[PDB]
Amino acid sequence: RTVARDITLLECVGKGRYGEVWRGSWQGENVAVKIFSSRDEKSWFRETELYNTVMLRHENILGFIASDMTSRHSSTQLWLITHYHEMGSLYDYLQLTTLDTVSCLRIVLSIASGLAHLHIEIFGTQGKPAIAHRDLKSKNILVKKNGQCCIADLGLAVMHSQSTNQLDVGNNPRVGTKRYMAPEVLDETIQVDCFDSYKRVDIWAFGLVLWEVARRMVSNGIVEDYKPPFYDVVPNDPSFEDMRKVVCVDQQRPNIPNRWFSDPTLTSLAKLMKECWYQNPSARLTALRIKKTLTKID
Numbered sequence: 251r252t253v254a255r256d257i258t259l260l261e262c263v264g265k266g267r268y269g270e271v272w273r274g275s276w277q278g279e280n281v282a283v284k285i286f287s288s289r290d291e292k293s294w295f296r297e298t299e300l301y302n303t304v305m306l307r308h309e310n311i312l313g314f315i316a317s318d319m320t321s322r323h324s325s326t327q328l329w330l331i332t333h334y335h336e337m338g339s340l341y342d343y344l345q346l347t348t349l350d351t352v353s354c355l356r357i358v359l360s361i362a363s364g365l366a367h368l369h370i371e372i373f374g375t376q377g378k379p380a381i382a383h384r385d386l387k388s389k390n391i392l393v394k395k396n397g398q399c400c401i402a403d404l405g406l407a408v409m410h411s412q413s414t415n416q417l418d419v420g421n422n423p424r425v426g427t428k429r430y431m432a433p434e435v436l437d438e439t440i441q442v443d444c445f446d447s448y449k450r451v452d453i454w455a456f457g458l459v460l461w462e463v464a465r466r467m468v469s470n471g472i473v474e475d476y477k478p479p480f481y482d483v484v485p486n487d488p489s490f491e492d493m494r495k496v497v498c499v500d501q502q503r504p505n506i507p508n509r510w511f512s513d514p515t516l517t518s519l520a521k522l523m524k525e526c527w528y529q530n531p532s533a534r535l536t537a538l539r540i541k542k543t544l545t546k547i548d
């Protein structure tokens with residue numbers, strides 16, 4: 251029922267090498283429309299597969315509405331239509347407000363719950379395969395009205411089924427965001443035919459998002475300004491070589507502000523954080539473990 255022809259493009263809320271994101275009106279209601287760039291057409295195919303064939307659906311995953319193609323301007327555009335969240339991306343949201351303890355934990359737990367849903371296979375007839383995201387970042391997370399978040403952008407998803415032991419890495423020349431790239435990626439030791447490798451890459455990236463969020467939690471009247479990971483050692487649009495020097499050569503990691511050690515929540519989150527950042531990919535916590543821990547912290 252929801253098709254591109256019937257959506258009114260109202261406002262452009264995002265632009266990048268992926269294409270554009272629009273706020274659209276469909277029967278009055280707001281919808282989110284990602285119009286893919288020509289260079290990113292493979293990500294549209296992958297997302298269309300996950301949302302339509304795998305039927306991905308979870309309260310902490312961006313709500314899919316429909317895939318469509320529309321011919322306009324003597325070209326054919328690939329659309330991905332999703333729910334629209336007034337609060338926007340976690341990246342923009344953190345820059346416009348600070349958090350108390352409850353709101354900080356609600357955010358990071360909701361992301362953990364979203365990531366656990368992806369990583370965990372559901373067995374049986376029409377079961378869902380295990381899925382690794384591979385481009386988790388604050389710009390690929392949206393904030394819902396109930397204070398929870400949801401994960402978006404499945405263009406690089408990798409899937410695995412324990413039964414057949416089938417690994418499906420797709421076929422996409424797209425490379426994850428360099429700022430959030432794990433060390434085993436930057437120095438090319440990652441084992442590309444092992445599904446656990448891609449999950450561990452998600453955990454590294456998650457750790458960085460948890461750092462971005464915690465910085466905005468107020469404790470004892472103190473709070474850090476929003477900053478992206480490695481803001482102090484790499485420039486904007488950091489190069490591959492820039493990231494390997496910081497993450498691999500100098501074995502650097504996001505700094506923990508000393509004021510975090512005066513707050514029990516931030517101290518536990520600091521520990522959680524770092525346990526996502528091991529150079530040794532197999533030492534990192536699993537998504538389910540993160541979710542469990544976040545459920546107990548208060």
Ligand SMILES: Cc1c(-c2cccc3ncccc23)ccc2nc[nH]c(=O)c12
Pocket residue numbers: 263264271282283284312330331332333334335336337338339389390391392402403
């Ligand atoms: C859903 C969304 C995206 C978005 C992010 C990542 C992947 C997406 N993929 C498809 C459609 C939108 C996507 C980007 C900006 C937004 N700004 C206000 N409200 C929104 O909901 C919103």
